[PDB]
Amino acid sequence: GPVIGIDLGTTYSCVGVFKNGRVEILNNELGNRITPSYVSFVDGERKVGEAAKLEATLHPTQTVFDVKRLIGRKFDDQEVVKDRSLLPYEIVNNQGKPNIKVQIKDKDTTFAPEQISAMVLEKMKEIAQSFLGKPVKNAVVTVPAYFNDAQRQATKDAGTIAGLNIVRIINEPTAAALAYGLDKKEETSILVYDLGGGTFDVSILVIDNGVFEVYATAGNTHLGGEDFDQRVMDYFIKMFKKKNNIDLRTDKRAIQKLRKEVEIAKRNLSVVHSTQIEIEDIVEGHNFSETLTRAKFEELNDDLFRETLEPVKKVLDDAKYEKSKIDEIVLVGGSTRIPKIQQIIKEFFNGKEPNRGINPDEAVAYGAAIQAGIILG
Ligand SMILES: C[C@@]1(O)[C@H](O)[C@@H](CO)O[C@H]1n1ccc2c(N)ncnc21
Ligand SMILES: C[C@@]1(O)[C@H](O)[C@@H](CO)O[C@H]1n1ccc2c(N)ncnc21
């Protein structure tokens, strides 16, 4: 039967199939090739993906996301204590493990992280099933190289709940290397720089006669595109207050409208130098109208961009690598489209050009789908 490829990411998933010799990264019901890893439990209905993320503004305690930060961990782990302080939905201690508590028709309902991940995997499965016109029972699913056996098993368990035999778990750096078609012959050292929506990962991946090994991995679990958006939000909230005596933080709907336009502006500024951010009646009777330049975008985030170099030094240190030992730098995640990111990496590596693919946001799912093709022969 068919084997699909799923990138089960912290903020977004992505599904691809290998069909007729091509990888097809599939569109969700709204025509997006990535789907927010969100599930909402509002008013007796369950939503998954973009419809769920839209519930976050008015129902923050019922909108579950970022479960990948909890899956396979213990409630008292330093990382989970930190995530409980950040996340708005209730996290409870079920026999030493974090569970998610929401209300369904007012009733307290408690989920394991793998049960929420299963709902995201089910939606990806359904996309593939309708694209292929066939039932899907098998998948390649990706994990971070740092995932321990409990974290990988919990991910496999989410697959089983979703009706997926996970026939292979592959690490995100291997998936990226397959997507970029990196030469499997002889010995090559690759830096995989993976800057996503919520998390930053960097890995030294050695490819030797077709065998993939991650020699070192480091990162920052709270550094991504969403942080760059927040820096811009903070600046424009302050400016709007100065100019209008309105603090937009006092209206959650106003913040949601602004956040949507800021995200688009950021993406625009990866190609142009100036963009307009416009919301009619951001509150009744008051329009929002600003220009954001690429230079101000970079100024607002430059310390965050330079923070991505601390993990790169650590993995070069762990592996005992000179910078020159890296043969190829490959960029994964849509945030790697930011020109300043590319410049800072190139300068760190004394002028070595990083390899950007055309669509770094889909590279992991693309590689998962290639792995699915390889396993079938
Ligand atoms: C959608 C994103 O904001 C998100 O934060 C992340 C998910 O990988 O990727 C970003 N992303 C996606 C595309 C993109 C862009 N052209 N310029 C900056 N960031 C970009
Ligand atoms: C908010 C203000 O009532 C302020 O209190 C007053 C004195 O500076 O003038 C208005 N103000 C301040 C700045 C500003 C602006 N850029 N566009 C409209 N109104 C503006």
mmCIF file of all heavy atoms in Angstrom, residues 166-200:
data_model
loop_
_atom_site.group_PDB
_atom_site.id
_atom_site.type_symbol
_atom_site.label_atom_id
_atom_site.label_comp_id
_atom_site.label_asym_id
_atom_site.label_seq_id
_atom_site.Cartn_x
_atom_site.Cartn_y
_atom_site.Cartn_z
ATOM 1 N N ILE A 166 3.886 3.722 11.660
ATOM 2 C CA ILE A 166 5.090 4.533 11.334
ATOM 3 C C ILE A 166 6.210 3.557 11.017
ATOM 4 O O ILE A 166 6.810 3.055 11.953
ATOM 5 C CB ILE A 166 5.389 5.579 12.417
ATOM 6 C CG1 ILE A 166 4.199 6.550 12.445
ATOM 7 C CG2 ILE A 166 6.713 6.261 12.109
ATOM 8 C CD1 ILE A 166 4.336 7.742 13.363
ATOM 9 N N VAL A 167 6.455 3.340 9.715
ATOM 10 C CA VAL A 167 7.377 2.293 9.191
ATOM 11 C C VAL A 167 8.810 2.770 9.376
ATOM 12 O O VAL A 167 9.698 1.921 9.439
ATOM 13 C CB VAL A 167 7.087 1.930 7.721
ATOM 14 C CG1 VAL A 167 5.688 1.370 7.539
ATOM 15 C CG2 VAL A 167 7.308 3.100 6.777
ATOM 16 N N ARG A 168 9.035 4.078 9.522
ATOM 17 C CA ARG A 168 10.374 4.597 9.812
ATOM 18 C C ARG A 168 10.235 5.963 10.477
ATOM 19 O O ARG A 168 9.442 6.795 10.023
ATOM 20 C CB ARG A 168 11.191 4.718 8.514
ATOM 21 C CG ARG A 168 12.654 5.080 8.721
ATOM 22 C CD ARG A 168 13.573 3.964 9.140
ATOM 23 N NE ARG A 168 13.401 2.708 8.408
ATOM 24 C CZ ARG A 168 14.009 2.352 7.265
ATOM 25 N NH1 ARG A 168 14.850 3.158 6.646
ATOM 26 N NH2 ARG A 168 13.757 1.166 6.738
ATOM 27 N N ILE A 169 10.998 6.148 11.519
ATOM 28 C CA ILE A 169 11.232 7.469 12.135
ATOM 29 C C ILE A 169 12.570 7.929 11.576
ATOM 30 O O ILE A 169 13.531 7.147 11.629
ATOM 31 C CB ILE A 169 11.240 7.347 13.669
ATOM 32 C CG1 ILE A 169 9.837 7.036 14.188
ATOM 33 C CG2 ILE A 169 11.847 8.586 14.294
ATOM 34 C CD1 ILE A 169 8.897 8.208 14.234
ATOM 35 N N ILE A 170 12.623 9.099 10.952
ATOM 36 C CA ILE A 170 13.953 9.604 10.524
ATOM 37 C C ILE A 170 14.149 10.970 11.134
ATOM 38 O O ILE A 170 13.112 11.680 11.368
ATOM 39 C CB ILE A 170 14.173 9.608 8.992
ATOM 40 C CG1 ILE A 170 13.233 10.529 8.242
ATOM 41 C CG2 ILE A 170 14.167 8.184 8.435
ATOM 42 C CD1 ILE A 170 13.776 10.790 6.824
ATOM 43 N N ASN A 171 15.406 11.287 11.428
ATOM 44 C CA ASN A 171 15.703 12.593 12.052
ATOM 45 C C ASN A 171 15.603 13.671 10.968
ATOM 46 O O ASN A 171 15.785 13.398 9.752
ATOM 47 C CB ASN A 171 16.984 12.557 12.883
ATOM 48 C CG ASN A 171 18.254 12.291 12.116
ATOM 49 O OD1 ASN A 171 18.473 12.883 11.053
ATOM 50 N ND2 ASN A 171 19.129 11.465 12.708
ATOM 51 N N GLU A 172 15.279 14.862 11.402
ATOM 52 C CA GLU A 172 15.039 16.052 10.553
ATOM 53 C C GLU A 172 16.269 16.351 9.713
ATOM 54 O O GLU A 172 16.116 16.688 8.527
ATOM 55 C CB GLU A 172 14.481 17.194 11.419
ATOM 56 C CG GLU A 172 13.029 16.899 11.790
ATOM 57 C CD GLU A 172 12.389 17.576 13.001
ATOM 58 O OE1 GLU A 172 12.945 18.601 13.385
ATOM 59 O OE2 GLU A 172 11.305 17.044 13.527
ATOM 60 N N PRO A 173 17.510 16.268 10.219
ATOM 61 C CA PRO A 173 18.654 16.525 9.350
ATOM 62 C C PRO A 173 18.853 15.536 8.199
ATOM 63 O O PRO A 173 19.126 15.973 7.117
ATOM 64 C CB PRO A 173 19.841 16.474 10.284
ATOM 65 C CG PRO A 173 19.284 16.745 11.646
ATOM 66 C CD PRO A 173 17.920 16.115 11.628
ATOM 67 N N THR A 174 18.595 14.247 8.423
ATOM 68 C CA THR A 174 18.593 13.250 7.349
ATOM 69 C C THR A 174 17.517 13.591 6.322
ATOM 70 O O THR A 174 17.804 13.503 5.114
ATOM 71 C CB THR A 174 18.443 11.847 7.948
ATOM 72 O OG1 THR A 174 19.517 11.682 8.882
ATOM 73 C CG2 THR A 174 18.452 10.773 6.880
ATOM 74 N N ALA A 175 16.303 13.903 6.754
ATOM 75 C CA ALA A 175 15.178 14.259 5.854
ATOM 76 C C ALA A 175 15.606 15.427 4.942
ATOM 77 O O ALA A 175 15.388 15.360 3.718
ATOM 78 C CB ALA A 175 13.947 14.578 6.669
ATOM 79 N N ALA A 176 16.210 16.446 5.512
ATOM 80 C CA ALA A 176 16.667 17.645 4.787
ATOM 81 C C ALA A 176 17.711 17.225 3.751
ATOM 82 O O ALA A 176 17.636 17.677 2.586
ATOM 83 C CB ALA A 176 17.284 18.659 5.710
ATOM 84 N N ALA A 177 18.680 16.411 4.152
ATOM 85 C CA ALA A 177 19.730 15.922 3.221
ATOM 86 C C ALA A 177 19.133 15.144 2.040
ATOM 87 O O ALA A 177 19.647 15.272 0.926
ATOM 88 C CB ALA A 177 20.759 15.074 3.928
ATOM 89 N N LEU A 178 18.122 14.319 2.258
ATOM 90 C CA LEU A 178 17.424 13.592 1.181
ATOM 91 C C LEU A 178 16.737 14.622 0.282
ATOM 92 O O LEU A 178 16.816 14.480 -0.930
ATOM 93 C CB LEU A 178 16.428 12.595 1.778
ATOM 94 C CG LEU A 178 17.055 11.401 2.493
ATOM 95 C CD1 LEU A 178 15.932 10.531 3.101
ATOM 96 C CD2 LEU A 178 17.919 10.611 1.494
ATOM 97 N N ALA A 179 16.133 15.658 0.839
ATOM 98 C CA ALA A 179 15.346 16.619 0.017
ATOM 99 C C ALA A 179 16.288 17.364 -0.946
ATOM 100 O O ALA A 179 15.908 17.565 -2.096
ATOM 101 C CB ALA A 179 14.614 17.596 0.910
ATOM 102 N N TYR A 180 17.438 17.772 -0.442
ATOM 103 C CA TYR A 180 18.498 18.506 -1.155
ATOM 104 C C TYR A 180 19.315 17.571 -2.058
ATOM 105 O O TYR A 180 20.247 18.057 -2.717
ATOM 106 C CB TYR A 180 19.376 19.226 -0.157
ATOM 107 C CG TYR A 180 18.721 20.490 0.351
ATOM 108 C CD1 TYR A 180 18.379 20.670 1.658
ATOM 109 C CD2 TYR A 180 18.312 21.473 -0.529
ATOM 110 C CE1 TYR A 180 17.694 21.789 2.101
ATOM 111 C CE2 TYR A 180 17.647 22.617 -0.103
ATOM 112 C CZ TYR A 180 17.323 22.779 1.231
ATOM 113 O OH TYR A 180 16.674 23.898 1.676
ATOM 114 N N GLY A 181 19.052 16.280 -1.992
ATOM 115 C CA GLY A 181 19.665 15.271 -2.875
ATOM 116 C C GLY A 181 21.148 15.216 -2.659
ATOM 117 O O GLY A 181 21.899 14.969 -3.642
ATOM 118 N N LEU A 182 21.595 15.374 -1.413
ATOM 119 C CA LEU A 182 23.033 15.522 -1.151
ATOM 120 C C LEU A 182 23.724 14.205 -1.561
ATOM 121 O O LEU A 182 23.128 13.129 -1.349
ATOM 122 C CB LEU A 182 23.278 15.880 0.317
ATOM 123 C CG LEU A 182 22.701 17.228 0.757
ATOM 124 C CD1 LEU A 182 23.111 17.517 2.180
ATOM 125 C CD2 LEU A 182 23.132 18.353 -0.153
ATOM 126 N N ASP A 183 24.927 14.305 -2.148
ATOM 127 C CA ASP A 183 25.705 13.162 -2.713
ATOM 128 C C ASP A 183 25.925 12.143 -1.592
ATOM 129 O O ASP A 183 26.471 12.550 -0.512
ATOM 130 C CB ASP A 183 27.056 13.622 -3.300
ATOM 131 C CG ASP A 183 27.967 12.515 -3.857
ATOM 132 O OD1 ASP A 183 27.441 11.513 -4.417
ATOM 133 O OD2 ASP A 183 29.212 12.670 -3.747
ATOM 134 N N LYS A 184 25.454 10.916 -1.805
ATOM 135 C CA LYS A 184 25.574 9.814 -0.812
ATOM 136 C C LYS A 184 26.918 9.095 -0.974
ATOM 137 O O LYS A 184 27.270 8.366 -0.068
ATOM 138 C CB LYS A 184 24.395 8.854 -0.945
ATOM 139 C CG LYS A 184 23.045 9.479 -0.624
ATOM 140 C CD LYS A 184 21.891 8.475 -0.677
ATOM 141 C CE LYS A 184 20.568 9.186 -0.928
ATOM 142 N NZ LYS A 184 19.403 8.258 -0.980
ATOM 143 N N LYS A 185 27.704 9.359 -2.026
ATOM 144 C CA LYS A 185 28.995 8.650 -2.260
ATOM 145 C C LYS A 185 30.103 9.389 -1.519
ATOM 146 O O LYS A 185 29.978 10.595 -1.284
ATOM 147 C CB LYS A 185 29.299 8.551 -3.759
ATOM 148 C CG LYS A 185 28.418 7.553 -4.490
ATOM 149 C CD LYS A 185 28.397 7.753 -5.987
ATOM 150 C CE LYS A 185 28.476 6.455 -6.748
ATOM 151 N NZ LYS A 185 27.513 5.479 -6.190
ATOM 152 N N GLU A 186 31.138 8.664 -1.125
ATOM 153 C CA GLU A 186 32.300 9.247 -0.413
ATOM 154 C C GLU A 186 31.774 9.858 0.889
ATOM 155 O O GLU A 186 30.628 9.476 1.322
ATOM 156 C CB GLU A 186 33.029 10.280 -1.278
ATOM 157 C CG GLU A 186 33.472 9.732 -2.624
ATOM 158 C CD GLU A 186 33.711 10.787 -3.698
ATOM 159 O OE1 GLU A 186 33.204 11.944 -3.554
ATOM 160 O OE2 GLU A 186 34.389 10.444 -4.691
ATOM 161 N N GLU A 187 32.598 10.681 1.534
ATOM 162 C CA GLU A 187 32.319 11.234 2.873
ATOM 163 C C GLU A 187 32.170 12.752 2.743
ATOM 164 O O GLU A 187 33.022 13.382 2.108
ATOM 165 C CB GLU A 187 33.413 10.893 3.876
ATOM 166 C CG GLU A 187 32.911 10.984 5.302
ATOM 167 C CD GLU A 187 33.947 11.300 6.367
ATOM 168 O OE1 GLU A 187 34.658 12.315 6.194
ATOM 169 O OE2 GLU A 187 34.022 10.556 7.394
ATOM 170 N N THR A 188 31.075 13.287 3.259
ATOM 171 C CA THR A 188 30.734 14.737 3.218
ATOM 172 C C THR A 188 30.195 15.143 4.601
ATOM 173 O O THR A 188 29.412 14.351 5.151
ATOM 174 C CB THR A 188 29.696 15.065 2.127
ATOM 175 O OG1 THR A 188 29.920 14.369 0.892
ATOM 176 C CG2 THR A 188 29.656 16.547 1.810
ATOM 177 N N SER A 189 30.536 16.351 5.086
ATOM 178 C CA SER A 189 30.035 16.931 6.346
ATOM 179 C C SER A 189 29.130 18.126 6.012
ATOM 180 O O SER A 189 29.586 19.082 5.382
ATOM 181 C CB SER A 189 31.142 17.336 7.250
ATOM 182 O OG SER A 189 31.881 16.207 7.668
ATOM 183 N N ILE A 190 27.909 18.066 6.475
ATOM 184 C CA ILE A 190 26.856 19.058 6.184
ATOM 185 C C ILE A 190 26.456 19.732 7.490
ATOM 186 O O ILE A 190 26.239 19.059 8.504
ATOM 187 C CB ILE A 190 25.708 18.347 5.464
ATOM 188 C CG1 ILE A 190 26.225 17.733 4.158
ATOM 189 C CG2 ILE A 190 24.570 19.296 5.171
ATOM 190 C CD1 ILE A 190 26.326 16.261 4.231
ATOM 191 N N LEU A 191 26.338 21.058 7.469
ATOM 192 C CA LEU A 191 25.683 21.782 8.570
ATOM 193 C C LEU A 191 24.224 21.966 8.174
ATOM 194 O O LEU A 191 24.013 22.551 7.130
ATOM 195 C CB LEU A 191 26.349 23.132 8.826
ATOM 196 C CG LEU A 191 25.845 23.772 10.108
ATOM 197 C CD1 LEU A 191 26.598 23.242 11.293
ATOM 198 C CD2 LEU A 191 25.951 25.250 10.066
ATOM 199 N N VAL A 192 23.280 21.425 8.946
ATOM 200 C CA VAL A 192 21.845 21.601 8.705
ATOM 201 C C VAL A 192 21.365 22.681 9.678
ATOM 202 O O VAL A 192 21.394 22.443 10.890
ATOM 203 C CB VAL A 192 21.024 20.338 8.864
ATOM 204 C CG1 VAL A 192 19.573 20.626 8.494
ATOM 205 C CG2 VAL A 192 21.597 19.219 8.008
ATOM 206 N N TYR A 193 21.042 23.862 9.135
ATOM 207 C CA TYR A 193 20.585 25.021 9.921
ATOM 208 C C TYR A 193 19.083 25.122 9.728
ATOM 209 O O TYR A 193 18.652 25.399 8.617
ATOM 210 C CB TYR A 193 21.402 26.231 9.494
ATOM 211 C CG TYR A 193 21.044 27.523 10.167
ATOM 212 C CD1 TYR A 193 21.923 28.142 11.014
ATOM 213 C CD2 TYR A 193 19.871 28.219 9.824
ATOM 214 C CE1 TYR A 193 21.648 29.395 11.573
ATOM 215 C CE2 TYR A 193 19.607 29.481 10.357
ATOM 216 C CZ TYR A 193 20.496 30.064 11.241
ATOM 217 O OH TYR A 193 20.260 31.297 11.808
ATOM 218 N N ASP A 194 18.310 24.843 10.778
ATOM 219 C CA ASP A 194 16.848 24.605 10.716
ATOM 220 C C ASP A 194 16.176 25.650 11.606
ATOM 221 O O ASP A 194 16.110 25.468 12.843
ATOM 222 C CB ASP A 194 16.491 23.205 11.148
ATOM 223 C CG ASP A 194 15.011 22.859 11.016
ATOM 224 O OD1 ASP A 194 14.173 23.795 10.846
ATOM 225 O OD2 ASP A 194 14.705 21.627 11.009
ATOM 226 N N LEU A 195 15.768 26.739 11.009
ATOM 227 C CA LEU A 195 15.099 27.838 11.762
ATOM 228 C C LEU A 195 13.631 27.812 11.357
ATOM 229 O O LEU A 195 13.297 28.235 10.235
ATOM 230 C CB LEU A 195 15.848 29.135 11.485
ATOM 231 C CG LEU A 195 15.351 30.393 12.210
ATOM 232 C CD1 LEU A 195 15.397 30.228 13.729
ATOM 233 C CD2 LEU A 195 16.147 31.599 11.754
ATOM 234 N N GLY A 196 12.780 27.412 12.292
ATOM 235 C CA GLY A 196 11.343 27.251 12.017
ATOM 236 C C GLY A 196 10.532 28.412 12.558
ATOM 237 O O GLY A 196 11.103 29.486 12.741
ATOM 238 N N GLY A 197 9.249 28.168 12.833
ATOM 239 C CA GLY A 197 8.348 29.152 13.464
ATOM 240 C C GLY A 197 8.632 29.335 14.937
ATOM 241 O O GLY A 197 8.465 30.442 15.420
ATOM 242 N N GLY A 198 8.996 28.280 15.671
ATOM 243 C CA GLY A 198 9.084 28.388 17.138
ATOM 244 C C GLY A 198 10.419 27.937 17.658
ATOM 245 O O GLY A 198 10.772 28.265 18.813
ATOM 246 N N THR A 199 11.161 27.169 16.870
ATOM 247 C CA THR A 199 12.388 26.511 17.366
ATOM 248 C C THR A 199 13.530 26.646 16.354
ATOM 249 O O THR A 199 13.283 26.796 15.131
ATOM 250 C CB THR A 199 12.149 25.028 17.692
ATOM 251 O OG1 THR A 199 12.137 24.329 16.438
ATOM 252 C CG2 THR A 199 10.900 24.811 18.524
ATOM 253 N N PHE A 200 14.732 26.580 16.874
ATOM 254 C CA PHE A 200 15.989 26.633 16.101
ATOM 255 C C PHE A 200 16.771 25.357 16.407
ATOM 256 O O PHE A 200 17.111 25.138 17.574
ATOM 257 C CB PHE A 200 16.803 27.878 16.434
ATOM 258 C CG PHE A 200 18.142 27.861 15.764
ATOM 259 C CD1 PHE A 200 18.227 27.718 14.390
ATOM 260 C CD2 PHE A 200 19.304 27.933 16.470
ATOM 261 C CE1 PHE A 200 19.437 27.565 13.751
ATOM 262 C CE2 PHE A 200 20.521 27.841 15.829
ATOM 263 C CZ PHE A 200 20.589 27.683 14.460
#
